[PDB]
Structure 1
Amino acid sequence: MSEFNITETYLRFLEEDTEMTMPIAAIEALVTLLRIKTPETAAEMINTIKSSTEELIKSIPNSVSLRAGCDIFMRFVLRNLHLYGDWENCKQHLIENGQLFVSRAKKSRNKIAEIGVDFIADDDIILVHGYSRAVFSLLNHAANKFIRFRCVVTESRPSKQGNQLYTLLEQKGIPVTLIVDSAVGAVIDKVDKVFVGAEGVAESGGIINLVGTYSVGVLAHNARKPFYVVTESHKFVRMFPLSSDDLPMAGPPLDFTRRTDDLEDALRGPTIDYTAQEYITALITDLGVLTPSAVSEELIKMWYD
């Protein structure tokens, strides 16, 4: 009898497929929590799932996609707790709704492409940043559409993700180079469109993914090239920062301590930046193309009370 906390349920099926990502894995674990542990009373169910979400955030704090999944699960159990079935059917009604995310959010990524293929037009040199697999889910259907384009992939120092794209869509058959991440300003005068992928959307439209998407965003603004971001609808999160600095990793982004003998010195600054709403200009979700004030309204309506 599993306890669903850390790895007795969650981290097992992350090794089943390296295509499922973190937040829908969190959705799958949280629905299979109360799919079995349903002790016929509406009180301790919500206590169990709130305890489970807080210990799962307590497992890995610096992967804020997890917070997005573990909080839209609370929105799911709140709205499915609504319609007021007196808990007599909801013990069966909520769990038969249940797996509609793993039948729904799993097949959201081609629904992204079905509305985002009509962005990359003919002969567009494209800049992507980091292994954001929804961007590749758009680009796969774009190359299957037989449309002519070129791609440029940045480095993802120190998180290594930029080396994956050049070994991902090269074998699909797209002419692609791998620029280094510092060389954006000398090339973004030539890049037609730039895509990124978020690990979170704030309450105004923000990109909380990686090391330097604020840098490539402010390069996109002072080259006046359109800065799109491909995401999907399990990436909304309540966390609305105000600076370019989020929750810390373990200390401040500006360390000034002493290296003892030979410890690592690359990851000493920040690793997850923030982008304001001005630098993004259109984001892609399951809900269509979505201007950032629309994503602000969409995350302002389902989070108030």
Structure 2
Amino acid sequence: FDIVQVYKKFLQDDPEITMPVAAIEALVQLLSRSQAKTISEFMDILQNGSNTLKEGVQNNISLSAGCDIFQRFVTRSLHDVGDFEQCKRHLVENGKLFIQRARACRQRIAHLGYPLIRDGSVILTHGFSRGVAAVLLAAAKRHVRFKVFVTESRPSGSGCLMTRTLKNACIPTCMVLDSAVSFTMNRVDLVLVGAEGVVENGGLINQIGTFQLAVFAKHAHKPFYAVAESHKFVRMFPLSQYDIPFSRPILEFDDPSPETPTPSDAIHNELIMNEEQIRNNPTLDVTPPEFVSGLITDLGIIDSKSGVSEELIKLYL
């Protein structure tokens, strides 16, 4: 059934979908084509299916979150004198009626987020995030006068896409290098980032340059807001900002044996790292909750971030 192929399938299907939701839709259309009819048969199922899904995509955190939400909805109404089939249709029936809220969650976020931008302020964002864009755009329509710094986000290069996205809405933009983010913090009134996933302690898993912005923000005494939908909450507890499942081997060294001038103003765009080297660098980092001012979700703005824990507590019994 090649669940993986499907999961990737939505992802291209619809730019506005989230990796967790794409995993939920995956399991649904497996639950459609799933002959099943044994709880043993019925529940043996996805687990090999999300497992197969988890092992089929290399960075798996976000889809694992959407997964984790799915089965807990499954067993919690399979508990309850649970019959199988009524959930099997009801999930396949309302699958369209899932990527409904997921889209409504983002809009709910933007309606909560945009007042954080007030007249004459300068925003800083790292890379491209649909949620961040949603918040910024929603503020723009209300004729709010603001400007946005966008970090050239290597390796993804998401900075260009976000810059153009904001340029289309007549929002004044300016791109900054990953090395110049600290120098710009004095001109920044607010920092706004998205997140692929939010861990148990309310920490952020996102693009590799995220935590550096949160660090500069803390140092420059500027508010740092994260933008993520509720279904990005995942039960996993990184013990450091380095503790995550690695897709590829990372940060390993050369082994040379006897193997046989630049000014600072000089601009050498041809002097960047190659992709062989870049595949040795991480794709994601972790941002501790003590760097996050408030976490904007569809559930509202979570400042406690013992509250993200509260939600994951409710999810599991």
TM over 0.5: yes
Equivalent residues of 2:32, 2:89 under 8 A apart:
no
SS of residue matched to 2:277: coil
Structure 2 CA distance for partners of 1:176 and 1:99, relative to 1, 3 Å: same
Equivalent residues of 2:28, 2:95 under 8 A apart:
yes
1:250 aligns with 2:255: no
1:105-254 aligned within 5 A: 105-245=102-242, 246-252=244-250, 254=251
- Unaligned regions of 5+ residues in structure 2, if any? 260-273
**Among residues 296, 302, 305, which one is paired with 2:315 in the alignment?**
302
Could you tell me how far apart the structure 1 residues matched to 2:69 and 2:32 are?
Answer: 17
Report the CA distance between 1:157 and its aligned residue: 1.1
How much is the aligned-residue C-alpha RMSD, in angstroms? 2.4
1:280 aligns with 2:292: yes
Q: Cα deviation per residue 1:40-61 (whole Å; 9 max; x = unaligned)?
A: 3332222111111011111112
**Among residues 26, 37, 40, which one is paired with 1:43 in the alignment?**
40
**Among residues 51, 57, 77, which one is paired with 1:54 in the alignment?**
51
Equivalent residues of 1:231, 1:285 under 8 A apart:
yes
Q: Alignment length, in residue pairs?
A: 300
Equivalent residues of 2:126, 2:210 under 8 A apart:
yes
Could you tell me how far apart the structure 2 residues matched to 1:4 and 1:200 are?
Answer: 24
Equivalent residues of 2:152, 2:177 under 8 A apart:
yes
Could you tell me how far apart the structure 2 residues matched to 1:100 and 1:263 are?
Answer: 40
SS of residue matched to 2:115: coil
Could you tell me how far apart the structure 2 residues matched to 1:42 and 1:189 are?
Answer: 59
Shifted more, 119-128 versus 293-302: the winner is 293-302
SS of residue matched to 2:100: coil
Shifted more, 123-132 versus 67-76: the winner is 67-76
Could you tell me how far apart the structure 2 residues matched to 1:80 and 1:299 are?
Answer: 18
Shifted more, 271-280 versus 73-82: the winner is 73-82
Could you tell me how far apart the structure 1 residues matched to 2:21 and 2:114 are?
Answer: 23
Match of 1:76 in 2: 73
Which one-letter code corresponds to 2:296 in the other structure?
I
TM-score, normalised by the number of residues in structure 1? 0.89
SS of residue matched to 2:199: coil
SS of residue matched to 2:182: coil
Could you tell me how far apart the structure 2 residues matched to 1:145 and 1:82 are?
Answer: 47
Could you tell me how far apart the structure 2 residues matched to 1:268 and 1:220 are?
Answer: 27
Percent identical:
47
**Among residues 282, 287, 290, which one is paired with 1:270 in the alignment?**
282
Could you tell me how far apart the structure 2 residues matched to 1:289 and 1:90 are?
Answer: 32
Could you tell me how far apart the structure 1 residues matched to 2:141 and 2:186 are?
Answer: 28
Match of 1:65 in 2: 62
Could you tell me how far apart the structure 2 residues matched to 1:43 and 1:155 are?
Answer: 50
Which one-letter code corresponds to 1:251 in the other structure?
P
Structure 2 CA distance for partners of 1:43 and 1:103, relative to 1, 3 Å: farther
Equivalent residues of 1:34, 1:45 under 8 A apart:
no
SS of residue matched to 1:209: strand
Structure 2 CA distance for partners of 1:265 and 1:225, relative to 1, 3 Å: same
Higher helix share: 2
Equivalent residues of 2:65, 2:233 under 8 A apart:
yes
SS of residue matched to 2:81: coil
Report the CA distance between 1:76 and its aligned residue: 2.2
**Structure 1 runs, 4 residues or longer, greater than 6 Å off:** none
- Unaligned regions of 5+ residues in structure 1, if any? none
TM-score, normalised by the number of residues in structure 2? 0.86
Could you tell me how far apart the structure 2 residues matched to 1:108 and 1:91 are?
Answer: 24
